[PDB]
Write an enzyme that holds these catalytic residues in place. Sequence first.
Site, mmCIF file in Angstrom:
data_model
loop_
_atom_site.group_PDB
_atom_site.id
_atom_site.type_symbol
_atom_site.label_atom_id
_atom_site.label_comp_id
_atom_site.label_asym_id
_atom_site.label_seq_id
_atom_site.Cartn_x
_atom_site.Cartn_y
_atom_site.Cartn_z
ATOM 1 C CG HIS A 176 -5.467 -0.599 6.516
ATOM 2 N ND1 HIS A 176 -6.000 -1.853 6.731
ATOM 3 C CD2 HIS A 176 -5.765 -0.280 5.234
ATOM 4 C CE1 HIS A 176 -6.595 -2.272 5.628
ATOM 5 N NE2 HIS A 176 -6.466 -1.338 4.705
ATOM 6 C CG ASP A 223 -6.366 -4.200 9.048
ATOM 7 O OD1 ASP A 223 -7.130 -3.750 8.171
ATOM 8 O OD2 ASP A 223 -5.121 -4.121 8.978
ATOM 9 N NE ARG A 271 -3.703 -2.144 2.669
ATOM 10 C CZ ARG A 271 -3.468 -3.373 3.113
ATOM 11 N NH1 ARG A 271 -2.237 -3.727 3.467
ATOM 12 N NH2 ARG A 271 -4.459 -4.245 3.204
ATOM 13 N NE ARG A 296 -9.792 -7.973 5.233
ATOM 14 C CZ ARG A 296 -9.173 -7.118 4.427
ATOM 15 N NH1 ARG A 296 -8.110 -6.451 4.856
ATOM 16 N NH2 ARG A 296 -9.620 -6.922 3.195
#
Lengths: 322, 331, 317, 331
Positions: free
Chosen positions: D193, D166, D106, D169
Site C-alpha cells: 500500500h 488502492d 509512508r 481508487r
Amino acid sequence: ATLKEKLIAPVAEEETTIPNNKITVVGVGQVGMACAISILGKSLTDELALVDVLEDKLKGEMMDLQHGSLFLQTPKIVADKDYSVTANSKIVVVTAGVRVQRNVNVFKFIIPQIVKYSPDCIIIVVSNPVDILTYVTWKLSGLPKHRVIGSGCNLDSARFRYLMAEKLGVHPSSCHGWILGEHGDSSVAVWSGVNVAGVSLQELNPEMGTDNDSENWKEVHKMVVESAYEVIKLKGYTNWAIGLSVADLIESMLKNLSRIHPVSTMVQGMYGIENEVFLSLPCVLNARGLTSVINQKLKDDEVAQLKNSADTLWGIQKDLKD
Amino acid sequence: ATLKEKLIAPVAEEETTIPNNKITVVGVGQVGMACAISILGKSLTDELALVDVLEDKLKGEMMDLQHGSLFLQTPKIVADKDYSVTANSKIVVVTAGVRQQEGESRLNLVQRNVNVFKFIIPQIVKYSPDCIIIVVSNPVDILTYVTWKLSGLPKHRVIGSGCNLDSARFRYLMAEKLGVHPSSCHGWILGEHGDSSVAVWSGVNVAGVSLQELNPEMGTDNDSENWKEVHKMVVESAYEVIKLKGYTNWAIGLSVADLIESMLKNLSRIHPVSTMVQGMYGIENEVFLSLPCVLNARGLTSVINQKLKDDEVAQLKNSADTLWGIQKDLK
Amino acid sequence: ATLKEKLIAPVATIPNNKITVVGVGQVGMACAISILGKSLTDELALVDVLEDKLKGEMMDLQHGSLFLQTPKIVADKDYSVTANSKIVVVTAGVVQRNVNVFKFIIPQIVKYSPDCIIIVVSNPVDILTYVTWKLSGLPKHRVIGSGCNLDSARFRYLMAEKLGVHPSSCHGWILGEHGDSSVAVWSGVNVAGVSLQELNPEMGTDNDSENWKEVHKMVVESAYEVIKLKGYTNWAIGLSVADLIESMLKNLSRIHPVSTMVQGMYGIENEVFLSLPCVLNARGLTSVINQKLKDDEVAQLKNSADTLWGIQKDLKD
Amino acid sequence: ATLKEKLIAPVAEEETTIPNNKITVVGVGQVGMACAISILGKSLTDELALVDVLEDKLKGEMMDLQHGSLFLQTPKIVADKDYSVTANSKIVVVTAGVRQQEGESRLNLVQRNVNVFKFIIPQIVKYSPDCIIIVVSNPVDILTYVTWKLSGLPKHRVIGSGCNLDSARFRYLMAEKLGVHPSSCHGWILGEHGDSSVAVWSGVNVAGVSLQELNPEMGTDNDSENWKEVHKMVVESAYEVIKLKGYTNWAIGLSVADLIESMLKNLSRIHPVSTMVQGMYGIENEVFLSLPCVLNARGLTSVINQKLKDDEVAQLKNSADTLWGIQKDLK
Ligand SMILES: NC(=O)c1ccc[n+]([C@@H]2O[C@H](COP(=O)([O-])OP(=O)(O)OC[C@H]3O[C@@H](n4cnc5c(N)ncnc54)[C@H](O)[C@@H]3O)[C@@H](O)[C@H]2O)c1
Ligand SMILES: NC(=O)c1ccc[n+]([C@@H]2O[C@H](COP(=O)([O-])OP(=O)(O)OC[C@H]3O[C@@H](n4cnc5c(N)ncnc54)[C@H](O)[C@@H]3O)[C@@H](O)[C@H]2O)c1
Ligand SMILES: NC(=O)c1ccc[n+]([C@@H]2O[C@H](COP(=O)([O-])OP(=O)(O)OC[C@H]3O[C@@H](n4cnc5c(N)ncnc54)[C@H](O)[C@@H]3O)[C@@H](O)[C@H]2O)c1
Ligand SMILES: NC(=O)c1ccc[n+]([C@@H]2O[C@H](COP(=O)([O-])OP(=O)(O)OC[C@H]3O[C@@H](n4cnc5c(N)ncnc54)[C@H](O)[C@@H]3O)[C@@H](O)[C@H]2O)c1
C-alpha cells in the site's frame, strides 16, 4: 477509436441528464462533512454537490469522497466554489459560517446564489444562530415558508431522548419527549409529552420539571442545553450528532414519509407570537418540505418562554438591513 | 370539525403531488408479491401500485402490505383492476399470465401469454407514458419483444429480466463449489432464459483469475471438474424447484429488486438482461436475448461488447435461432 | 488436485446469529424473506414435515443468495438442522390439533438449541406461548409470543391514515389477547406527545365523533377481511416478526407489545400469557413496562386470563 | 424508589452480558472517527469502544456519537485510555500514530509507529485474546507484520487494510473512464500500500472481458489509453489529497467498514488485504503485502492463487524486497 467505444456499444442515445434527488452541502467544515458522510451512508442522493470558498480543501474533500465510490451508491460527487455546481438540487444544507453580523454577510451572498441555480429546492439551515439565520434565509431567498427549514431543536430532542434513555435503560427511540422553541440556552422541555409506551411520566411524578423533584428532570434539560458547550470544550466542536440528525430530516423529505420532527418554522400567529420569527415545533416533513405543524396544549410558562424567545430573536432581527 | 383539522395546522397550501419513484407491479401472484415485498424491503419506491384481474386477492394483498406500513418507508400503497391506479409510474413490473406446469417449457406459454399482453401493455403506457417496463412473465425474451412491439417505447425502456436470475444461480453454484461469496464469483449466463442459455466460460473468473486458463477443458465432455453439469443444474433449476414447491418466486423477486435498484439509484451497473441484439455476433433478426447491459435512470443505455470464443458465439446464435422461430410467427 | 485446491490457498463453522423458522407455510416464508431482507442472520434454518416443499423453498432462497448477506441457508425435517440457534420462530400448525403439534416440535427445538429464544406465532398465540413455555422449560424471558405486536401495527396504520402522517409518528398500544378481546389503551394514544384522549374525552365511548371504537374494531376485523380476500395473512406479520428479531439480535432494548407471562400483574392469578409493553434485547424479553390501566381495561385483561385459563387447565402434559 | 424501578418491572434477573459483535477503534483522529461513523452507519456493532491518549478529545468524540444514538442501532458507546474498555472485542481497528506530512513517504513513519504499537498491541490481546485485528496505521504492511509478532495471534486474525483502498481508487478511475459503476469494474492493485504497488493488468476486466486482450499495450509506455497513468494516479492519490486537505479519512473509513462487513456477516468475500505471503511468488521471508484474500468471521482464511505474468511477479517481488529491506532493521 477509444477503449470506451470498443468495449461499450450504446443502446440509448447520448444525453446530458439532470439528477433526480440531488443534494448540495454548503460548507465543508466539520459539520458539512459530517452531513455529507451521513447522507452518503444512507444512499439518499444520486448527486452530492459540495460548495465552499476554500478551493483547496474543497477539492480535497471531493476527491476523498470519490475514492470511496465503490462502497457507496452515489454515482456523481462534485464540488466547486462556483454555485453553478449546485444546479437542480432538491435539498440544500447550509452549514457555512463562523462558529450574527458576520454570518449575515455570508448569507447575503450564499442564499441568492442557491435559489438562482436551484429555484425549486428545499433549504435546511444548520449554521448558528440557526433560528435567526433561518429567518435571514427565508427573507433573502423569497421562498415560501414550507421550503425553509431550520435544523432547530431536532438535535436538542435527540440529546434529551438519549439522556432519558440512559435513565431508564431502553432505546432512545422508545423514549419520547420534545425540546422546543429556541435552539440553545432558552429551549423549552414540554414535560407533559414526556412518556414511555404511552405512560405519561409527569402523571407518575407531578413535580417533573420543578425544583423539588426526586427524579431531577430539570437537570436533564440543563444537560441538553450544556451538551454543546461540554463537547465543544472537549473536542473543539460538534459534528457527528448534527450530521446524523440532518440525514434523518433528509430521509423523511426525499422518501415523502410525513414524519414529525422538531424543526424550526415561521411561528408568527401561534401562541400569541406577533413577529416573524422561527422557533422549533413538531412539524411534518415530506417531499414538499415542512407542510404541517402540530397544535399543542402548552402550559402558560411554556408559552411564556416561547414569547420571550420570540421577543429576543426579533430584537436582533429588526436591526438587520437588506 | 375533524381530528386532523384540530391537530394538524397547515403550513403549505393543499395540493396533490406526483410521486417521485412510483413502481407498478402487474399481477399479484407468487412472483408479483415477491417482487413487491423485495422492492418495499429495500425502500425503493414512495408509491407502490398493484394491478390484477382477481379483485378480491388484489385487495387482500394491498391491505396486508398496508398493515405492515409501520415497518416500511412507502407512504402510499394502492391497488385496483383499473390501470388508472398506475398513473405516473417510473417502472412497471409485469408478472401476469400463466406459469410452467411441472415439466413444461417456458416456450409452451407463448400464445396464452401473448394474448394477456395485448390487453395490458396498451393500458400501461396509456397511464404511464414515461415509464420503464420490466418483463418477468415467461417466455421473458419473447414477451420482451412483444412488449417492445405493443407499447411503441424505445428499446432502452423495455427490459426483460432475462438471465439476471440465471447468472445468479450460476454464481451461487460457483460459490458453493469454491467456498466464497457469490458476489466474489463472476460468470455470465447469456441468451435465452431457458433451455438454450449459454454459459460464457471465457469470462468465468475469481479475483481476475480466468478459470478456463486454469482448466482449458472447462465446459467440454473431457472435464475433470464437470463444469457442464453446473450449467445443466442452472438450466434444470426452475424445473427442479417447480417439481418440489410448484413454482419459483423468491429468487426472481430479489433479482427484479436488484435491477430496479440499479435504475432508480442511477448506478450504471451491468446486468445480464434481455435486449434487442440485432447485428451482434451474427444475429440477423430482431431477436431479444440476454447480454451484459448497463442499467441506470434512463433504462438500458448500453450493451457490453464481448470477445466470445467460437463455441460460445455458435451457442449464442443457436439460442437466437431457437428464439427467432417462435417470434417470426407471432400475429 | 481439485480446482478448489488449485485456486484457494488456505491460511486458517459455528454460526454467530443463527435463526430457525419452523413451518414454511405462507407465514413462515414471509418471516424468512423479511429476515433475509434485513440481513439479520448469518445462518437461516427451515424446518417442516412436508419434505418436498421444504426443499423447494430452501432452493429458491439459495438461488437468490447473490442478492443477500446470509451465507448459509439449510433445511431439513430433522431438527438437528436447527442446532445452536439464537432465535427460533414457530409458525407451524393448522387448539387440540396445534397442541399435539407443539408437543412434538418444542422438545426438539430445546434439544438442539438449549439456549435459544423462541418466538411463537401460531394461533391461538397466547395459548400456544404458554404451551411452549411449559414444554420447553425455558425461563419466561426466553419465550415470546408475537401477541398484539401486529395488532398495534395495524392500529398505528389506521391512526396514520386518519391523520395523514407516518405510522411511526403515531403512538398507541393494543394489549391483552390477540383475538377479538384485545384492549385499546386509549390514554396512551398520542401524536408528538399530544394526548388525543385529552383532546377528545369521548375517545373509546359510544358517542364519539371521531369513532375511535370503530378503529379498534377495524384492527380486529382487518385480520378476518384479509383472510376472506386472499385466503390468509402473512406479509404484515412477517415484517413484524423481523422487527422483533432486529431488536433482540442488535440488543436494542426497544419496547414492543409482545405476549409474556402476566401472573401477578393486574390481579391475574393464573399462569397466562398476555401482551404488555415489553423491552426486548439480546437476552430476550427482559422487562415489562408498568402501566396504570383503567378499570375496564384491567377487567378485560382478567376476563381474557379467565378464558385462557379455562382452556389451559384441561391440557395434559 | 427510583423512576427506573417504578416504571420498569424486571422479567429477567440482572446478568453480566457479553456483547455479540463488539468493535474497538484505537485512535480517534481523522481516520479513527471516519471508521467509527462508517461502522455505526452500517449498524455493524452492538458495542463500539474508543481508545486514545488524548483523554479530553476522546470523551468529546464519545459524547458526540452518543448524542446521535437515536439515529443509530448501537446501544453502547464507550471510551477510555485504559484498554479494559476494549474487552471482548470481535474486531480491533488500529488507526493510532503519526501520519504523513506533505510529501512524506509512508515508510518514513515506521520507527515512530512501531514504538506506538509496542505498547498498544499487547494491551489489545490481553483483553480480547480471540479478536481480529485490522491494522490501518502506516506503513500498514510493515505494521501488520509488527502487530502479528507482538500479538501472538494466528495469521488469519491479523489483517492490514492494505490495497483495499488502492483497488477502490483504481476501480473508481476505471469507472470514470468507462462510465459505469466502480462495482461493475474489476481490477486489483496488489503489493505494498504505497509507491511500489502493482497493478495486475492481466486481471482487469468488465463483465469478464479482459481489457489487456483488447489492448495488449496496457501498462506499457506506448499505450494509447495511458493505463500506466491510471496506476500513477492511484499511487499519487494520497499525496494529492494530503496536499489539498492535510490528510485522508473518508475513503479509508468506508474501506474498513467494507472489510468489517464481510467478516462480521461471515460472507467470505474477496478483498485485497495485507497478509503474510512467505512462500508465494518466490518470496522467501515473512513479509506482509496485499493479495486477494477471503474474509469471513474467522478473519483471513484463504488467499487466491493467481496466474500473474512474469512482469507482474517481478514487480510484486520488488515490492516485497522493499518492505523486507525495512523489515530487517526492526528490533
Ligand atoms: N444547528 C446545530 O445544532 C449545529 C450543531 C453544530 C454546529 N452548528 C453550526 O454549524 C456551523 C458549522 O460549524 P463547523 O464546525 O463546520 O465550522 P467549520 O469552521 O469547521 O466550518 C466552517 C466552513 O464554512 C466555510 N465558510 C466560511 N465563510 C464562508 C463563505 N462566505 N461562503 C462559503 N463558505 C464559507 C469555511 O470555508 C468552512 O469550511 C457553525 O456555525 C456551527 O455553529 C450548528
Ligand atoms: N423471469 C423469470 O425468471 C421468472 C421466474 C418465475 C416465474 N416467472 C413467470 O412469472 C409469471 C408469474 O408466475 P406466478 O408464479 O406469479 O403465477 P401465479 O398464477 O401465482 O400469478 C399469476 C397472476 O397473474 C394474474 N393475471 C393473469 N392474467 C392477468 C391479466 N390479464 N391482467 C392482470 N393480471 C393477470 C393472475 O390473476 C395471477 O394472480 C409466470 O408467467 C412465470 O412463468 C418468471
Ligand atoms: N399471530 C399472528 O399475528 C398470526 C398472523 C397470521 C397467521 N398466524 C398463524 O400462523 C400459522 C401459519 O399460518 P400459514 O398461513 O403459514 O398456514 P400454512 O398452512 O400456509 O402453513 C402451515 C405450515 O405448518 C407446517 N406444519 C404442520 N405441522 C408441522 C410439524 N409438526 N412440524 C413442522 N411443520 C409443520 C405445514 O407443513 C405447513 O407448511 C397459522 O396457524 C396462523 O394461525 C398468526
Ligand atoms: N492504510 C491506509 O490506507 C490509510 C489511509 C489514511 C491514513 N492512514 C494512516 O492512519 C493513521 C491515522 O491518521 P489520522 O489522520 O487519523 O491521524 P490523526 O493525527 O488525525 O490521529 C492520530 C490519533 O492517534 C492517537 N494516538 C497517537 N499515539 C497513540 C498511542 N500511543 N495510543 C493511542 N492513541 C494514540 C492520537 O491521539 C490521534 O488522535 C496515520 O498513521 C495514517 O498514515 C492509513
